[PDB]
Amino acid sequence: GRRALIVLAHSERTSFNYAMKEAAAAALKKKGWEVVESDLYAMNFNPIISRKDITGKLKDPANFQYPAESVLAYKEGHLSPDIVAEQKKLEAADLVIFQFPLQWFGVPAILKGWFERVFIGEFAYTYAAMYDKGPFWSKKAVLSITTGGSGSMYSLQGIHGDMNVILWPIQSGILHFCGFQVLEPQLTYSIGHTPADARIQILEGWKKRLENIWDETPLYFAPSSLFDLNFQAGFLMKKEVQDEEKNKKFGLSVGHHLGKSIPTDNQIKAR
Amino acid sequence: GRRALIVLAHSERTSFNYAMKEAAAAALKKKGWEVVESDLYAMNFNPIISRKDITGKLKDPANFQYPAESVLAYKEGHLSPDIVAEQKKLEAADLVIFQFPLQWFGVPAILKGWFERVFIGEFAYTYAAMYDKGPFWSKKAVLSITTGGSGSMYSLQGIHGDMNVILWPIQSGILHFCGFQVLEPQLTYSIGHTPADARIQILEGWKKRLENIWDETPLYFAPSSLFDLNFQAGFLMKKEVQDEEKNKKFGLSVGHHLGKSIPTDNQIKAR
Ligand SMILES: Cc1cc2nc3c(=O)[nH]c(=O)nc-3n(C[C@H](O)[C@H](O)[C@H](O)COP(=O)(O)OP(=O)(O)OC[C@H]3O[C@@H](n4cnc5c(N)ncnc54)[C@H](O)[C@@H]3O)c2cc1C
Ligand SMILES: Cc1cc2nc3c(=O)[nH]c(=O)nc-3n(C[C@H](O)[C@H](O)[C@H](O)COP(=O)(O)OP(=O)(O)OC[C@H]3O[C@@H](n4cnc5c(N)ncnc54)[C@H](O)[C@@H]3O)c2cc1C
Numbered sequence: 413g414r415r416a417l418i419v420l421a422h423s424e425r426t427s428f429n430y431a432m433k434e435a436a437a438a439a440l441k442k443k444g445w446e447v448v449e450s451d452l453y454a455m456n457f458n459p460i461i462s463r464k465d466i467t468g469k470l471k472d473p474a475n476f477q478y479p480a481e482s483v484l485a486y487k488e489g490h491l492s493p494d495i496v497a498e499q500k501k502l503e504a505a506d507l508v509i510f511q512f513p514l515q516w517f518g519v520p521a522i523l524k525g526w527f528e529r530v531f532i533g534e535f536a537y538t539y540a541a542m543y544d545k546g547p548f549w550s551k552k553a554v555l556s557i558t559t560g561g562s563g564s565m566y567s568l569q570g571i572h573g574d575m576n577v578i579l580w581p582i583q584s585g586i587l588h589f590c591g592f593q594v595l596e597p598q599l600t601y602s603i604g605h606t607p608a609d610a611r612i613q614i615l616e617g618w619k620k621r622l623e624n625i626w627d628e629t630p631l632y633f634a635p636s637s638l639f640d641l642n643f644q645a646g647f648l649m650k651k652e653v654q655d656e657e658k659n660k661k662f663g664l665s666v667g668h669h670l671g672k673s674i675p676t677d678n679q680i681k682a683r
Numbered sequence: 684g685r686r687a688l689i690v691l692a693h694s695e696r697t698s699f700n701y702a703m704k705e706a707a708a709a710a711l712k713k714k715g716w717e718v719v720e721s722d723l724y725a726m727n728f729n730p731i732i733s734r735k736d737i738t739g740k741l742k743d744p745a746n747f748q749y750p751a752e753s754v755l756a757y758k759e760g761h762l763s764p765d766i767v768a769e770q771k772k773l774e775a776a777d778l779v780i781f782q783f784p785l786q787w788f789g790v791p792a793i794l795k796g797w798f799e800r801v802f803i804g805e806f807a808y809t810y811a812a813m814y815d816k817g818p819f820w821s822k823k824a825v826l827s828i829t830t831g832g833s834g835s836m837y838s839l840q841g842i843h844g845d846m847n848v849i850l851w852p853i854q855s856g857i858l859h860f861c862g863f864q865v866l867e868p869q870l871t872y873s874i875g876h877t878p879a880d881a882r883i884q885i886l887e888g889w890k891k892r893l894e895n896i897w898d899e900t901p902l903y904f905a906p907s908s909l910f911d912l913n914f915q916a917g918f919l920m921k922k923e924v925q926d927e928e929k930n931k932k933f934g935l936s937v938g939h940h941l942g943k944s945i946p947t948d949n950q951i952k953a954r
Pocket of ligand 1 (some may be wrong): 422426428430431514515516517558559560561562604611612652748749799800856
């Protein structure tokens with residue numbers, strides 16, 4: 413069996429988010445997965461990066477810089493116990509599910525703090541090995557999101573704008589940057605206005621998808637080989653690559669739109 | 684005699700972010716501004732939403748729903764006073780400056796939670812009063828952001844992709860949604876690789892800009908008058924507007940790209 417980690421960011425057992433977490437765990441276990449969860453609220457997880465994330469002496473206590481100090485602590489085994497426990501969950505996991513309600517067009521603060529304290533340099537990323545060469549290359553991640561607003565609001569013509577744009581900083585910036593293959597997000601729009609029978613089927617749909625989740629085609633991101641990955645070239649797209657794209661009508665992705673048309677549902681549907 | 688609020692999200696008084704906050708306060712005060720600060724770390728601000736944000740019995744404790752419960756607490760005066768104190772800072776402020784290091788392509792968790800606990804419904808937004816009809820329509824907000832990554836990384840051809848996409852969920856989804864006119868963000872790229880002399884100039888340029896900050900043209904967002912703002916129409920773009928926009932080369936904004944070219948630096952430069 414593969415290993416699954418479910419990171420849940422919701423404080424209520426009675427929420428649809430909790431129900432989705434239970435549905436996921438149940439479905440995966442039946443298919444032979446070992447399932448571990450991170451119920452951040454139940455954990456009362458400390459969401460705030462600080463010098464307390466490092467046990468014992470710092471390298472430069474008078475001028476504390478979290479990136480350098482947290483990296484050093486990781487290498488020397490001096491990270492805070494709660495951080496280390498989470499990192500071990502990540503290392504064991506093949507599939508990571510992030511279950512959360514959309515909050516101010518992003519992840520809840522407690523989940524954002526989880527990323528900030530757990531995704532430490534060298535462990536989760538290096539400038540030498542980033543995006544598709546990232547440490548989590550063998551792992552797959554998926555966002556399971558619930559929203560208050562309807563799907564129409566997040567359509568191209570909706571008042572909020574394209575949901576693909578909202579998803580990008582998370583799926584590309586956080587997950588893919590660390591090497592994750594990112595699967596199509598499970599989007600549950602206006603769950604507060606969804607009829608009872610329909611909420612039941614959404615749960616069943618989620619269970620059914622997870623039966624074959626590992627064999628899905630992941631979302632498309634621009635491969636890192638298209639870029640000159642060094643400070644001298646400023647991590648810019650290769651000259652020959654740019655030349656080849658000048659005849660193309662569509663951009664490569666949401667973030668790499670190149671001033672052209674973004675491919676439809678680049679962050680919502682796989683090729 | 685206008686009033687400014689500076690929200691800072693950095694743990695270290697020795698940081699450049701703190702220096703930017705200090706420079707902003709002094710520059711504004713010299714021009715006669717009243718300046719109030721929210722140093723979230725120094726305030727030990729709690730960024731995690733919970734039932735205890737309501738200082739009394741809940742309307743529906745068996746099924747706790749934060750949006751409805753927090754709005755009810757707001758109207759009845761049963762919001763936690765640490766939230767109330769922040770809300771009063773916002774009421775008095777004409778200009779709001781958010782000073783923070785870019786962290787995982789968004790705001791630090793402590794600031795995210797600040798938005799989540801303080802921007803309560805009715806106080807900060809309603810489905811009737813949203814975007815340009817929002818409660819903060821008379822106010823202006825600006826992001827002052829420092830990054831570890833270079834500006835080229837966030838260019839159209841950069842490995843991280845377009846920064847305008849990264850800014851959208853914050854500037855449109857959080858700030859503009861509540862009514863704020865959003866001014867051009869102060870972007871300070873690769874501050875960790877900036878020589879001492881250039882760091883001095885960055886501080887001065889920030890001070891110089893703030894001398895006439897209120898006279899600046901705000902960023903462009905699609906006007907809400909272009910949309911049918913009701914649930915029956917799903918808050919979609921008006922039929923006449925859609926047909927008219929079909930003849931426009933560029934999308935309206937980052938989020939309202941409409942599957943077309945995004946206007947250059949829509950979230951970075953004013954028209
Ligand atoms: C601070 C904040 C910011 C927000 N920002 C945004 C935003 O930017 N955009 C946006 O769209 N929304 C936003 N929201 C709204 C938020 O996304 C929704 O309130 C949330 O997604 C609702 O999910 P829930 O899990 O709380 O469901 P709940 O509202 O708790 O439950 C929904 C329904 O599911 C039912 N249910 C529960 N368990 C089961 C089960 N086992 N089987 C069947 N039915 C069940 C419940 O009875 C309920 O009727 C925000 C909310 C907050 C508090
Ligand atoms: C969890 C996390 C996630 C991150 N995610 C991202 C990301 O997604 N993208 C990205 O690009 N970056 C990211 N970063 C990097 C981050 O954006 C930078 O570390 C941050 O912007 C640096 O700001 P600072 O104020 O800490 O600078 P500091 O490192 O504190 O200061 C830089 C220099 O300024 C000098 N200085 C301080 N005060 C003064 C003064 N008064 N006058 C002159 N000089 C002074 C200091 O001596 C120091 O040498 C992340 C960092 C963390 C910790």
